[PDB]
Amino acid sequence: GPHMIKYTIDELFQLKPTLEVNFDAVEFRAIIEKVKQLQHLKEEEF
Amino acid sequence: VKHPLNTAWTLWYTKPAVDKSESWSDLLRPVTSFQTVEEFWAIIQNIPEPHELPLKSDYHVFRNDVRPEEANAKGGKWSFQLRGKGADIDELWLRTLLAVIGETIDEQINGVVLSIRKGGNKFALWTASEDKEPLLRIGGKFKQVLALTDDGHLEFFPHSSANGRHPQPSITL
Ligand SMILES: [Zn+2]
Ligand SMILES: [Zn+2]
Numbered sequence: 001g002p003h004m005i006k007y008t009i010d011e012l013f014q015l016k017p018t019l020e021v022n023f024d025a026v027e028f029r030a031i032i033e034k035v036k037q038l039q040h041l042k043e044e045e046f
Numbered sequence: 047v048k049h050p051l052n053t054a055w056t057l058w059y060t061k062p063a064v065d066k067s068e069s070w071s072d073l074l075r076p077v078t079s080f081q082t083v084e085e086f087w088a089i090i091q092n093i094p095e096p097h098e099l100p101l102k103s104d105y106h107v108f109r110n111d112v113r114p115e116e117a118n119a120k121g122g123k124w125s126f127q128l129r130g131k132g133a134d135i136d137e138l139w140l141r142t143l144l145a146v147i148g149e150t151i152d153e154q155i156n157g158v159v160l161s162i163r164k165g166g167n168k169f170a171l172w173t174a175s176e177d178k179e180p181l182l183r184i185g186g187k188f189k190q191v192l193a194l195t196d197d198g199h200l201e202f203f204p205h206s207s208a209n210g211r212h213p214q215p216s217i218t219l
Contacts, residue, residue, distance in 0.1 A: 005052045007148035009141060012083055015049055019088040023078040028093065031061065035100040038064045
């Protein structure tokens with residue numbers, strides 16, 4: 001039959017805490033920053 | 047100490063194309079998966095906030111057995127246009143994610159998408175539901191999560207409208 005676990009928003013915030021992740025967070029940020037660099041160079045602001 | 051979530055979820059990122067040719071590649075990539083509250087917060091702490099993302103970025107947070115994609119699939123999306131709430135995008139996004147992974151928005155909810163676009167950012171809550179009765183309850187709860195007291199920011203688009211160039215919502219709240 002059914003199965004469920006529910007947490008309220010407040011409950012989840014109360015469980016919020018360097019925190020380890022399982023992906024390369026440095027590379028992920030670097031990719032996004034490189035995109036912003038290229039968008040800035042290519043958009044004509046003036 | 048672990049607080050398990052009802053299901054596992056995957057965060058996906060859609061990277062903006064910087065060259066025309068990149069539109070021929072798969073720019074939608076899975077970032078990481080999580081299945082506890084602690085794992086969720088570790089991810090949030092280690093990824094850029096919505097307001098920092100380049101134009102044409104998307105974040106997708108979907109149940110593990112759901113890729114973020116037919117027109118003839120069942121259900122649709124509740125689309126939230128930030129408009130005048132745009133300064134609060136990071137907190138509204140986080141609250142939406144908590145409502146989803148904590149299963150309090152839901153009766154089902156497949157995933158949620160953040161879209162960064164010129165002129166205006168939006169979120170989309172993807173549901174398999176069709177009947178207006180559950181969709182109105184979902185949309186009303188979503189509206190409460192977002193602390194919206196005016197009408198017009200929420201539009202429900204059935205999956206069928208995806209085929210269109212000018213899709214039209216069947217519910218607006
Ligand atoms: Zn400049
Ligand atoms: Zn912040």
